[PDB]
Design a protein. Structure first.
Lengths: 86, 440, 106, 440, 440, 106, 142
């Protein structure tokens, strides 16, 4: 995890948004065909970042997108590519 | 202007249209004030405040400059990123989008020079356009052509040939193993060769070459015309003759005519080749004008199955080839892609590499573009010591020997010479071609 | 200089010498690596205007070895020796055909 | 190339098309070789000599560079004059002429930067084009407007107004004494205001203002559309409503659409206003692109009654105003006219001066353009302290007070202030306007 | 209301339209007052008496409730029988008949729930309609298919397949021995597969299968579209390609569009398959809505050669299958036929049994529907362990083994298993299919 | 798994093994029962686009025995053995053809 | 079905079409399995698996049920929230949107009764339609 990513996760959790994640292999990425990762069901900053680090290690060589989730409206407030194969 | 239009804290909506401009401000004018002014002059900005303005929501239709950065390793040059609301634009109109963005700003006085580098089309807007009549995937299906780039050829000389002699050249090129031939950009309907004669003799060349070889052949019939009614007359006759494909010069003929024709093509199952004549008036100079990448994106919306892209800056070209082929393109500044771009399942456009290429380039071109491209050999085909047909065979063998070598795992950059040299041993046509043109 | 002979062709790789079994395997290895699904097609004629050839069995979806395809080409040869046999390949992510090359001429 | 294409002793035929290019050759490349190459690459020139070339007369279709001169007071910059045979071109097609001349050369590698300065259209070619649907003379007849420039006004704000409120603004502007109002370039058919509503409410504004005043009023209805079929639909509805005039953005919409529409206009007696949106992408920079003068000439062929020209380099503008108005224009380099040009009785196009002008400019604008022009006051009308209608009256009084003063023999440069100051004494609307904007 | 609209001694005329309504009255409301209210609300009844009513013969256009009976073994639930004069309705309009009968009554407050069970169309009304474009007898003639039910198959997956991949799957099904393949209800013209591509590749798949097998093949091309103009554009192209048959979703697209299309189908000799997409919104709940039997009757009038009816309540289905096939159907309440219906020689509509059927269902479906039916095996064909073609052959052997055994006098309910098992002995395709799917 | 062989078929019962005289008779018994009128048709070709085949003699209207039709099938067989022969039925009440199945192939 | 079509942690995209269904499951059927079934039946779900499905990206065109909530004060009655991809629908077609969403689910057997309560049309889809020929503001003007 990089400092820029941590800053965003800090910002989203302080605004009371949930952290979501989806992955795609090199082929699926090109067609914009994403698949949801194991859900991070936590608000605690230490637990969220620990699960994110565990997620990126599981999907090595795959595009991983971070999602900010408004749980009241069930809407994505934030989308950022946080991993790429290389 | 700065207080209103320069909004560094603004985050762009997904419905926003985003534009990246490269600018030099006139000495004295700071970058921030100049950026705000690009946002103003391209949206609403005017010298006076009138009473009618108070009858409308002013903030609503306003272009916001949300980012300014200095261009790395260049003095007095800056990128300004501008957001525009979706409301500003007429649905399904390239004409309106250009008129709205590039209509005035370029003649703005406080800017020394302006260049539009990239545009993000939002998905909401993309869906209002037809896009390509067919796209990459449908086109390979229609032609039964899989797993290799398609080969083309432009008939030389540009002017002078009678329609019958034209067809003869076409026929010999196609029978040798090219997929396509094409009319030259400026071939339209001159006295030496009237269009309707050309279409007629070319159609007979295609039939003969197709029957002999057993492969689908085509020729990009230039339907670029003085009026829309003339263009449609030519397009309609090409359909009558059962021609798979036609060409159009979108920049000279304009976007309205191009959009008209791409709708016609969809309705009549004809494939649309797009020639980028006049592009370097707009896109050559780094400091001023519109980068081709933007025009390519605009063409993908307006409609076209093929688009000329050039041959091989390298990374810039590899950048906009992705923008015209893929569904999702991440922002990569090294490749000149400024914004992430989603096409929301709009089909891709086949890039057409053309201009001063021969058999020795073939391995490099396959490594660069891959299977979804059209490679065009004007003089590479007709300039062969034995004439058009063995000239074509030489190219076709060269191509298929590369594609085979690529799939077999061989490195087309280190082994590219050996690959051709080996294929020359069993193909006399190719051996001749490898001797005439020197290795690159 | 020589005049080119008139000859019928069959799209990709038909301008090359007829592919040996080792060369066919090499192409399948490429498809497995690209994650395309091999399919064998056979047809009595080869007209450019026709889109379809008869499917030999079903596309090998969980294809791991090229030998698995070659064995199915060998079988289709014994059954339809008088026909043209072709190897087609499918990208299920781009949802299109990606490969199509001839393997047998009668 | 030099031996064949650079022919300094060649005298151009009267049937030849002549092009003047400004170029910088890449260091090492001499001017003569580079000039010949501009002639080659714009006509026939290619990297290889093919067998098919011998089936045709090669010299026939060849562009000749007959003069090269260094640009005065500029290093590494040269003018090359190139002659093209009449045969090269499709009759009555601007598209083909541009495709033929500017299609490739601009991307030529041995040239650092290329700019097309002027084109001589030969009379033989000019006669194949319709020209303006009406021209200057017919237009004054149709509108009963003699002996003064025509006044216009662009409705602000650019976007945002409902069709009804739009018409209201229009009506107030026209009732005050303007001849025309106009749609903004980017006003087409957005969600906030659909075209057909706008046409309907504008038509009612014209009727009301015309009946009140007893003078012919108009509004340039923007018929620029995503397709040719849409454009024709809008044009047709404007005719249905009995509208005297429509507008088109020729550079964005393209030449084919423009030529289509100008033919339609001729057939239906509608006047065609032409807006030069996107022009400064092509014509701003001195070093590269196409000078506007060339595009103006091209428009006069394609068709258009009015054309935006800018407001006031001065001598350059006075140069191409003559090219778009007169029948015969002598070559005058000081005014940027490179070739003598005959129009063979093709009607003139009315220049439209627009942009950041107010009452104080009025005397200068009358001295510069004269009676055959359209002067456009966007903010000069709507920005008046009392609103649109007295705003219009202020402009109209200012104009007629100048025209009277000019005819009476008064010098509009020395006395221009006094002329307005005197007319302010009896016109309270004008006095208000003279107080708001400072004297230039 | 009861004094006027409840007329228990009225005996209807042969020219009357008759409606059967199942209703529950709100607690406190008696059944007779409720039935009277249905009659009024579906005809003329209103809360106030106006003077304009005295200008007309009020009794003439009055819906009479002539019978009320309680539903056996269901508390607070009644059938009302209502008669409408022939003067109430527009000739040839299914749209008007619905708007008239079902337009208001269902929102009536004193009724807890209302369901329309049956309509009797009087012969005088039937003659004003076109009916099916061809009907059962003409359809069998046009396709040379006699003495057996017709076989179909829906291509899966529902979305995703490219036009070419779609056609491949079609071709393989049709060559295997199915008479028809169909588009899925929701396949129209999406970005992954545009309609005109799908039409083109399917047309080619039909030619190959028809040339192979030597039997007439077809595919129900979905012509359902956003506008009537789009719909006709699609139907017309399917005619151009020489397609025997098209499909339409009559409920979602609506009756006006459907009637338009059925007229076109008569005039262009194309068969019309009708899909019942969205029916279970209206026809599922027993207590409220319109029973499908009624919608079937409307469609026979509106126009349709085929109609989906489901697979097999048993008796209710057998009832409305007669209604859509026979000329004279006697009233029979066990089969839910409330009124005797005569069709005045209007041709019948073929029922299509579809969804969740495999080879073991074959003897049952032949026994139930007989020869005048289409049977549709979506997963029943494509789900076969060896693919579409052997899948189709397995169905076609199963069907022809059943028909033969039916004609030979074998009982298809008791011996049905043995019949299939016997044909499995000489057909390896079927034996594979009999292994995969479990016996029912 | 096996690939389906390309075979020309001739409508109803053409996917079953060719009908024996006993099987044909049983089908005619059905037609007599339903009150359909048997007709023997023959043709040199079986093209799907063509509606009509040539009628052998006249339809057997007052047909009580299946043997009566079999004898007319046997006669047409010797006269046009190179041809396809088909048995067609007629419903005079519904006023349409109801049966049409192949009996002999050349 | 539940493993594939019930995705309670899926957060919908701005480009998705969203449907709210009120449903009663048949006795014995759990609400989650019923909601999953609505998602399948209104999108791709079928009784058998075919080979042609492997020729396409199956996950791409799949209706996901992302929320199930019980209706307050009404026994055996639930709201299902289902998300559909924008690729499912023809541009400018109300006919297609209905045929796609309401075309099959209502006749589904494990559901006692189904009622469609609300649809969210994504802006990307809204732009493909004409809308009212004039609308409120233009009508008052006219």
């Amino acid at each position: 995890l990089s400092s820029e990513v941590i800053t965003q996760v800090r910002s989203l959790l302080n605004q009371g948004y949930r952290i979501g994640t989806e992955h795609a292999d090199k082929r699926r990425f090109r067609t914009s065909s994403w698949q949801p990762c194991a859900p991070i069901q936590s608000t605690n900053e230490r637990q969220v970042l620990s699960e994110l680090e565990n997620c990126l290690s599981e999907h090595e060589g795959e595009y991983v997108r971070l999602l900010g989730i408004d749980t009241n409206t069930r809407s994505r407030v934030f989308e950022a590519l946080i991993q790429r194969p290389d | 202007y700065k207080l209103t239009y320069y909004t560094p804290d603004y985050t762009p909506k997904d419905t926003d249209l985003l534009a990246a401009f490269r600018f030099s401000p006139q000495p004295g004018v700071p970058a921030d004030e100049a950026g705000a002014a690009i946002a103003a002059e391209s949206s609403t900005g005017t010298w006076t405040t009138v009473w009618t303005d108070l009858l409308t929501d002013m903030d609503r239709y306003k272009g916001k400059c949300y980012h300014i950065e200095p261009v790395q390793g260049e003095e007095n040059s800056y990128f300004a990123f501008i957001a525009y609301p979706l409301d500003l634009f007429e649905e399904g109109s390239v004409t309106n989008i250009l008129t709205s963005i590039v209509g005035n700003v370029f003649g703005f006085k406080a800017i020394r020079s302006l260049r539009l580098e990239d545009i993000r089309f939002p998905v909401a807007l993309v869906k209002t356009f037809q896009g390509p009549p067919h796209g990459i995937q449908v086109e390979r299906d229609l032609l039964n052509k899989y797993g290799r780039p398609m080969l083309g050829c432009t008939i030389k000389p540009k002017l002078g040939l009678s329609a019958k002699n034209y067809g003869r050249a076409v026929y010999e090129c196609l029978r040798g193993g090219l997929d396509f031939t094409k009319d030259d950009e400026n071939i339209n309907s001159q006295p030496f060769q009237r269009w309707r004669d050309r279409f007629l003799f070319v159609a007979d060349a295609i039939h003969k070459s197709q029957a002999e070889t057993g492969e689908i052949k085509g020729h990009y019939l230039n339907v670029t015309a003085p009026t829309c009614e003339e263009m449609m007359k030519r397009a309609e006759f090409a359909k009558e003759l059962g021609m798979p494909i036609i060409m159009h010069d979108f920049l000279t003929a304009g976007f309205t005519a191009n959009t008209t024709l791409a709708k016609w093509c969809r309705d009549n199952g004809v494939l649309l080749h797009i020639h980028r004549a006049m592009h370097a008036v707009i896109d050559r100079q780094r400091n001023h004008g519109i980068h081709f990448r933007v025009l390519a994106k605009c063409l993908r919306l307006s409609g076209g199955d093929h688009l000329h892209s050039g041959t091989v800056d390298k990374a810039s070209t590899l950048g906009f080839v992705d923008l015209m082929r893929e569904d999702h393109i991440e922002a990569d500044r090294s490749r000149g892609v400024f914004f992430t771009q989603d096409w929301a399942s709009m089909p891709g456009v086949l890039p057409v590499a053309s201009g001063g290429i021969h058999v020795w380039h073939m391995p490099a071109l396959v490594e660069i573009f891959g299977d979804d491209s059209v490679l065009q050999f004007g003089g590479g085909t007709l300039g062969h010591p034995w004439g058009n047909a063995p000239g074509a065979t030489a190219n076709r063998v060269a191509l298929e020997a590369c594609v085979q070598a690529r799939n077999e795992g061989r490195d087309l950059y280190r082994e590219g010479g050996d690959i051709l040299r080996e294929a020359g041993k069993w193909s006399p046509e190719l051996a001749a071609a490898l001797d005439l043109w020197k290795e690159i | 200089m020589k005049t080119l002979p008139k000859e019928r062709r069959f799209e990709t790789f038909s301008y090359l010498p007829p592919l040996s079994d080792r060369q066919i395997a090499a192409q399948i290895e490429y498809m497995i690596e690209q994650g395309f699904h091999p399919l064998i097609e056979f047809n009595e004629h080869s007209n450019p205007e026709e889109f379809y050839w008869t499917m030999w069995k079903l596309p090998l979806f969980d294809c791991k070895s090229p030998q698995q395809v070659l064995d199915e080409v060998r079988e289709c040869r014994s059954e339809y020796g008088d026909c043209y046999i072709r190897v087609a390949g499918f990208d299920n992510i781009k949802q299109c055909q990606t490969v199509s090359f001839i393997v047998h001429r009668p």
